[PDB]
Amino acid sequence: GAQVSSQKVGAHESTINYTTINYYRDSASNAASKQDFSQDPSKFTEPIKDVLIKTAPMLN
Amino acid sequence: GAQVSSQKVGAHESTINYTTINYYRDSASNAASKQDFSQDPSKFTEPIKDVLIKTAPMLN
Amino acid sequence: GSSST
Amino acid sequence: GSSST
Amino acid sequence: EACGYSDRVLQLTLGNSTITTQEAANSVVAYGRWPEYLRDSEANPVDQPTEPDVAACRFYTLDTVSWTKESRGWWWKLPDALRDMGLFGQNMYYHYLGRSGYTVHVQCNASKFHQGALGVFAVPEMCLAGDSNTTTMYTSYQNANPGEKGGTFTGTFTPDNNQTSPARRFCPVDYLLGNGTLLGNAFVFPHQIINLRTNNCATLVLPYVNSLSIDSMVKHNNWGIAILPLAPLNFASESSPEIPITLTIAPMCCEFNGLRNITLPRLQ
Amino acid sequence: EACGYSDRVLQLTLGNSTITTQEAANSVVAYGRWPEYLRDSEANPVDQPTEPDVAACRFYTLDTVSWTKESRGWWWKLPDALRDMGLFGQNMYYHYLGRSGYTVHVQCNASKFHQGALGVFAVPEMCLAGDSNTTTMYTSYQNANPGEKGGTFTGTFTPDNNQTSPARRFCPVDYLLGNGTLLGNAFVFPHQIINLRTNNCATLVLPYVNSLSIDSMVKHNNWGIAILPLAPLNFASESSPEIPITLTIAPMCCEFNGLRNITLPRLQ
Amino acid sequence: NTTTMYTSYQNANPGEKGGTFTGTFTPDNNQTSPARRFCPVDYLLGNGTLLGNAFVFPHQIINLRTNNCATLVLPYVNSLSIDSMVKHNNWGIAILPLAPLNFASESSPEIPITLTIAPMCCEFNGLRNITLPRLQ
Amino acid sequence: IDDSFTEGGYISVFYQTRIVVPLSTPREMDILGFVSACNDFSVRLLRDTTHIEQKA
Amino acid sequence: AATSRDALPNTEASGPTHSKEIPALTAVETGATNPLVPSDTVQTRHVVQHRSRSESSIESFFARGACVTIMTVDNPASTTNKDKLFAVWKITYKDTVQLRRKLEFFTYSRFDMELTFVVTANFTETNNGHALNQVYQIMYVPPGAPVPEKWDDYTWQTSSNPSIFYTYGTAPARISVPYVGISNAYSHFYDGFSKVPLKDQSAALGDSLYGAASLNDFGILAVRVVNDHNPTKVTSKIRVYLKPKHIRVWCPRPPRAVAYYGPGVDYKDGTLTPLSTKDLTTY
Amino acid sequence: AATSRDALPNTEASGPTHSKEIPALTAVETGATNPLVPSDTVQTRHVVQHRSRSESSIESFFARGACVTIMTVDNPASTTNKDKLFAVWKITYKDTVQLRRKLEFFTYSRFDMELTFVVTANFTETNNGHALNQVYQIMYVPPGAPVPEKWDDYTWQTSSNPSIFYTYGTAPARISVPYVGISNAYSHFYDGFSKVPLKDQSAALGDSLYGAASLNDFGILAVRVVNDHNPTKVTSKIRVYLKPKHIRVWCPRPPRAVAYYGPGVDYKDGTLTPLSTKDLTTY
Ligand SMILES: CCCCCCCCCCCCC/C=C\[C@H](O)[C@H](N)CO
Ligand SMILES: CCCCCCCCCCCCC/C=C\[C@H](O)[C@H](N)CO
Ligand SMILES: *C(=O)CCCCCCCCCCCCC
Ligand SMILES: *C(=O)CCCCCCCCCCCCC
């Protein structure tokens, strides 16, 4: 049940990996993976009904 | 001898699993798996000799 | 080895 | 066994 | 059924005895388990068991009691209530060990103008509370075991204040089910209700229940039968109505081990 | 059915409401037509209809009336009787147009020793006769529309002689069905009879009936409910028996058109 | 500043008339019969955060030289799928002058602001008798 | 526990018509009521009860 | 195959009804509970149910250590007139009330038992003397084995009895024990006696307590401070926590509604009125 | 598939422009922010961008234990007139300010909660007496369960409530808790009341606090020293650290700009001027 993931190696001395085994039944007990996703800011930066083309006039 | 089971993941950050190894000869020393079964309440809620059909009269 | 549930 | 990411 | 069969009309036959009823409310099989003989994989005493079959697995009728507006309720213990019943009782007292299931048939008819409702409960290990606040767990064997006459519930706890010669009997308070738990919850035990407008009887088929495959019937009661008026007897405008309650009980799949001379208990 | 199902025992469920009965005489569907929404081929107002569904198509119980030996009969109009009933009434007064069908359940139980028979009639366009012989067609909107309290029938026609301030109400004579036709013929309208020895209720399922697909519910009543004692109440040897009559009515497949501000009618 | 979280239901819920923002916080000093109303200071967005950041909320600006209206389509937002509308407000509409009204050289110009709002995809559960709230 | 935010509402019973009896019959009687959970019912966050204690 | 953490059944959408099917009408005399669901009596929508009964499985309901006793011991100056206190406790879940009430929702049970020991100590006399770190001996003395009469007598050798030597200030001690009953299940209630009174025998001779089976059901724990006497007296307490692991239960019972009064089901006068005043037509 | 640790976009080289394309001109009335990048308004070179937003992911921004409370307890001489102090704390992140402000960048959140407990003790009277090592009991009492009235009453049995027995001087205690909300997310802001005031009811009867939902939202922690009274009094403090693990957040908000004043959004007179003087044309 071991999970093997790669580290993003910053300062250097192949891929360096690290290992993780969950010891508990409850997922709440797990550490944080930090394997997170990004999204586009559009729902906040461009919430307009008609798609914005930045080279065009915003008002036409 | 490792046992690998899945966690029911509640709050999220695939299947997340966890690992279990029993360290002792006596099953009494084992932790609780919590992998438990449910049953129908009928032996207490419907202990009648003739099967009950809920849309029908209980007395006929 | 490993059991899996 | 082992998962790999 | 289109050929006339009904939930309300039943016939039960065990040994040389038959019960009929025309106003049943179906019948209950406690925990969905029909009585059975002890299986080899669960067996414990190794001697050949005695299994009296029809000689003991037949309907025995106990003494009829009377329901009135002041009745608080009645109780019996099994096998105790049947200890003097024909060859069942003999088989019981001749053997160290015995196990048995039961068909319990409570009988109480009245009329379309009477009303009232009896809760009929079968309780596994029906431990009742004693009359004492000077000594706990003090109810004597003789008082714990009334035989067929049974015992009664009371609406009032009254502590035995005679310290010199204590009564040593139960004081089973009705809303506390005689054991310190609320009567409204007794329905989690296998039960039926005799509600006079609906039915004139209760039928409970009880498996042998215990933390052992077989045990001392003389030392230990497996089941308790508790009958309490959930709704009081009432009739027309009479102030003092009465209707009888009769218990008929049949042992089922009973077997006994450890034969010797007969037990002669101190019952008074 | 061999599984126990009966003509006499029914359960009706509409929205968050359920009616049960154990002494029905089947139920009636007026003219064999179940209620329906307005079809596109018969549609007339073109705006999107409002269809409140469970918010209005549910059982509303009106004020209980009392049946006695001197009762001559009662009447209600639909939709008028339901004009103040929860979201049905709101939907009605907010829209120019509305149409609706109904399940009408009249309730009246007694005992095996009582007797009497109520004719329960659902009449399309139940125009009633006025109290005047000085001015015809003069019953005021307020008197024509009692709301849930309904109105009553009388055994006697009595003309309003106040010419200065006329009563302007109906004077519906019972053997003339309140409209100048003989009551013995009212059975050509969808009906049931509550005959106490037989049944304790009447159930009539009414389709929307009209010479139009939809209309002003506030100006026009589609159905009238008329309840008359065909055989008078009687009990044991009491001179003044009473039993209650309760009406519970549910709108069915109701839809509304022409939304605007709410109508605030002059009802007194 | 004598009792926190004390704004009464009646004052929290003005209905259609709404409420207003103020440029000045003034604490209710009547301790015997407290006003029990909001004191929403404008540069603090009525809630203790700076107004210049309110643009992280869904917004539009009515800048008179450019446009004469704002249109915001709001989804139902909540930590639950459905809730008590009578106990709880899901959205607040806040309108503040980012640049003050001005006209020609009149000292006291006025122009009207009208709100028109339409419910969308609304559904209700738990029907009973009608709620009759204490609103004053 | 009693909590306004998670209040459940109101259970009540009314006479729809009335109880009717013939002569020679009791004019008053009892009804009994029972409550139970449906198959969609669940509980969570285990805790100690206030329904028993042990003072001293 | 239905597991405790499975989602409960979905609500299926259901519409209006007008038929001879009567789910709402029933007859509780039969002894059965009417198996209804909302779509039987009202109009429902389709709901995809996610909730589960995982936390109310028998295992989860009991998966907590409960305090069942507090044992007191000490280690006095050698010069004291009073003997060094060692503790003896008859193992039971009935000296406290909370776990007892939970187990008593059922008539019988089977489980492996986990015992955890929390140990605390303090000074008693307004002295200024110190004491070095204490080691405690928790010895299980099963029915039949010699119970210690003195803090230092031969029984504390433990050649065959299991003992825990616990060091103060370390993690609380813990052991597991299998299902050790002499029956196929533990009896939470025994409606009987351990003796039959015979006619030919005196009443005293045939007598025994109601509801009591083996006098020494499970034996005792005997606890001592192993350290020799110290000039300054220290008193310690050993709190015992019981957790039923791997549990099975049979025959449900109404819970205890009035205060416990002894190891049996007896009740005390003046404690029999649990319920409070509330008016029939008051919400 | 774009991850938090991925490099941000490269700058693409761009040259001179003379066209009808007008990236620089926009109209903020629309409610949108102009999505420009340097090559839209100046000449750029090609740059291979290596920087990432890994440390500002919601998880990373919150991946720290923050102190949310300090609980005080003690263990006095038995002879004292004052009761032995045990602590009771209503669980919340609003007694301190730093984690509160971070969570309040958002309207709603979901997370698993990690609680870490740091425990320190000291002597108070200018005595010379000692105290043996203390064990602490941290009991979670969820809404409805009996709150302890005395350091030693029956509730500390914990048959069903979760408790931590912590030994002084050992590693700080730590537990995890799942997302336990009764809503689909935690509400950092609730614009409403827990009661509707009805006309037919008195104002007192319909009243409730603004913005407050369940009175006892999450229950309390009750902490005690398990050791018996000691001649020399020791006072201890339990510092509680909260870390939101596995977190999700919704609906961004402007951060708190003036001092917190209570659990709501209220502010205090005299604290409303965060900004400082700076002249419009002064760098
Ligand atoms: C070094 C420490 C070892 C401790 C060993 C303890 C062994 C004894 C186990 C006792 C089991 C108690 C179970 C509870 C009680 C029973 O259920 C009922 N009174 C019925 O039999
Ligand atoms: C043995 C120690 C166990 C401790 C168990 C703690 C359980 C209670 C968890 C509380 C969760 C608090 C989350 C923060 C606050 C809420 O977000 C907001 N006020 C909105 O609901
Ligand atoms: C998957 O986990 C199979 C490989 C197992 C590797 C060794 C596990 C190391 C110890 C884990 C103990 C269990 C934790 C409760
Ligand atoms: C099955 O267990 C084979 C895999 C072994 C994995 C590593 C075991 C980790 C250490 C266990 C030690 C033994 C416990 C007494």
PDB file of C-alpha atoms in Angstrom, chain F residues 52-129:
ATOM      1  CA  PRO F  52     -48.559  25.198  -8.645  1.00  0.00           C
ATOM      2  CA  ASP F  53     -48.614  21.386  -8.492  1.00  0.00           C
ATOM      3  CA  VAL F  54     -48.120  20.130  -4.847  1.00  0.00           C
ATOM      4  CA  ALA F  55     -48.395  23.640  -3.359  1.00  0.00           C
ATOM      5  CA  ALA F  56     -52.073  23.717  -4.259  1.00  0.00           C
ATOM      6  CA  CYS F  57     -53.055  20.172  -5.272  1.00  0.00           C
ATOM      7  CA  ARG F  58     -53.397  18.885  -1.770  1.00  0.00           C
ATOM      8  CA  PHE F  59     -56.270  18.201   0.671  1.00  0.00           C
ATOM      9  CA  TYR F  60     -57.765  21.245   2.383  1.00  0.00           C
ATOM     10  CA  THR F  61     -60.269  20.597   5.234  1.00  0.00           C
ATOM     11  CA  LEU F  62     -63.146  23.094   5.522  1.00  0.00           C
ATOM     12  CA  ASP F  63     -65.055  24.007   8.748  1.00  0.00           C
ATOM     13  CA  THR F  64     -66.957  21.029  10.137  1.00  0.00           C
ATOM     14  CA  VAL F  65     -70.751  21.324  10.120  1.00  0.00           C
ATOM     15  CA  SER F  66     -73.321  19.491  12.256  1.00  0.00           C
ATOM     16  CA  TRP F  67     -76.089  17.072  11.184  1.00  0.00           C
ATOM     17  CA  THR F  68     -79.205  17.000  13.304  1.00  0.00           C
ATOM     18  CA  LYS F  69     -82.854  15.915  12.943  1.00  0.00           C
ATOM     19  CA  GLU F  70     -83.751  19.420  11.798  1.00  0.00           C
ATOM     20  CA  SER F  71     -80.982  19.744   9.185  1.00  0.00           C
ATOM     21  CA  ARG F  72     -82.333  20.485   5.714  1.00  0.00           C
ATOM     22  CA  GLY F  73     -79.005  20.378   3.856  1.00  0.00           C
ATOM     23  CA  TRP F  74     -75.845  22.226   2.908  1.00  0.00           C
ATOM     24  CA  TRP F  75     -74.162  23.640  -0.176  1.00  0.00           C
ATOM     25  CA  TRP F  76     -70.747  24.896  -1.278  1.00  0.00           C
ATOM     26  CA  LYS F  77     -69.418  26.238  -4.608  1.00  0.00           C
ATOM     27  CA  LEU F  78     -66.029  25.486  -6.243  1.00  0.00           C
ATOM     28  CA  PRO F  79     -63.636  27.169  -6.483  1.00  0.00           C
ATOM     29  CA  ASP F  80     -65.297  29.548  -3.966  1.00  0.00           C
ATOM     30  CA  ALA F  81     -65.111  27.191  -0.952  1.00  0.00           C
ATOM     31  CA  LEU F  82     -61.343  27.028  -1.451  1.00  0.00           C
ATOM     32  CA  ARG F  83     -60.652  30.755  -2.108  1.00  0.00           C
ATOM     33  CA  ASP F  84     -58.841  31.119   1.211  1.00  0.00           C
ATOM     34  CA  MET F  85     -56.997  27.828   1.114  1.00  0.00           C
ATOM     35  CA  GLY F  86     -53.248  28.241   1.303  1.00  0.00           C
ATOM     36  CA  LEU F  87     -51.380  28.667  -1.978  1.00  0.00           C
ATOM     37  CA  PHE F  88     -54.394  27.540  -4.069  1.00  0.00           C
ATOM     38  CA  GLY F  89     -56.291  30.677  -3.006  1.00  0.00           C
ATOM     39  CA  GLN F  90     -53.227  32.887  -3.591  1.00  0.00           C
ATOM     40  CA  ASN F  91     -52.754  31.552  -7.052  1.00  0.00           C
ATOM     41  CA  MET F  92     -56.417  32.067  -7.745  1.00  0.00           C
ATOM     42  CA  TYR F  93     -56.530  35.725  -6.682  1.00  0.00           C
ATOM     43  CA  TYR F  94     -53.258  36.677  -8.415  1.00  0.00           C
ATOM     44  CA  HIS F  95     -54.359  35.515 -11.876  1.00  0.00           C
ATOM     45  CA  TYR F  96     -57.158  36.634 -14.242  1.00  0.00           C
ATOM     46  CA  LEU F  97     -57.764  33.076 -15.350  1.00  0.00           C
ATOM     47  CA  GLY F  98     -57.640  29.694 -13.663  1.00  0.00           C
ATOM     48  CA  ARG F  99     -58.932  26.094 -14.146  1.00  0.00           C
ATOM     49  CA  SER F 100     -59.014  23.176 -11.749  1.00  0.00           C
ATOM     50  CA  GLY F 101     -60.380  19.731 -11.077  1.00  0.00           C
ATOM     51  CA  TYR F 102     -61.018  18.390  -7.524  1.00  0.00           C
ATOM     52  CA  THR F 103     -61.098  15.337  -5.272  1.00  0.00           C
ATOM     53  CA  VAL F 104     -64.033  15.916  -2.895  1.00  0.00           C
ATOM     54  CA  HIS F 105     -64.065  13.780   0.237  1.00  0.00           C
ATOM     55  CA  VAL F 106     -67.125  14.089   2.483  1.00  0.00           C
ATOM     56  CA  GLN F 107     -66.674  12.553   5.941  1.00  0.00           C
ATOM     57  CA  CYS F 108     -69.402  11.416   8.356  1.00  0.00           C
ATOM     58  CA  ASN F 109     -69.127   8.484  10.747  1.00  0.00           C
ATOM     59  CA  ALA F 110     -71.617   7.361  13.366  1.00  0.00           C
ATOM     60  CA  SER F 111     -72.312   3.851  14.796  1.00  0.00           C
ATOM     61  CA  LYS F 112     -74.086   0.584  14.011  1.00  0.00           C
ATOM     62  CA  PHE F 113     -77.038   1.868  16.010  1.00  0.00           C
ATOM     63  CA  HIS F 114     -77.459   5.198  14.179  1.00  0.00           C
ATOM     64  CA  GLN F 115     -79.273   5.627  10.840  1.00  0.00           C
ATOM     65  CA  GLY F 116     -79.645   8.215   8.107  1.00  0.00           C
ATOM     66  CA  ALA F 117     -78.588   8.855   4.561  1.00  0.00           C
ATOM     67  CA  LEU F 118     -76.906  11.861   2.999  1.00  0.00           C
ATOM     68  CA  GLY F 119     -77.146  12.477  -0.729  1.00  0.00           C
ATOM     69  CA  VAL F 120     -73.807  14.024  -1.849  1.00  0.00           C
ATOM     70  CA  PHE F 121     -74.145  15.635  -5.252  1.00  0.00           C
ATOM     71  CA  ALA F 122     -71.614  17.369  -7.467  1.00  0.00           C
ATOM     72  CA  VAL F 123     -73.485  19.705  -9.845  1.00  0.00           C
ATOM     73  CA  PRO F 124     -71.791  21.518 -12.824  1.00  0.00           C
ATOM     74  CA  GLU F 125     -73.055  25.174 -12.960  1.00  0.00           C
ATOM     75  CA  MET F 126     -75.120  24.870  -9.754  1.00  0.00           C
ATOM     76  CA  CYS F 127     -77.195  27.997 -10.191  1.00  0.00           C
ATOM     77  CA  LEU F 128     -79.377  28.500  -7.107  1.00  0.00           C
ATOM     78  CA  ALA F 129     -82.696  30.381  -6.815  1.00  0.00           C
TER      79      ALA F 129
END
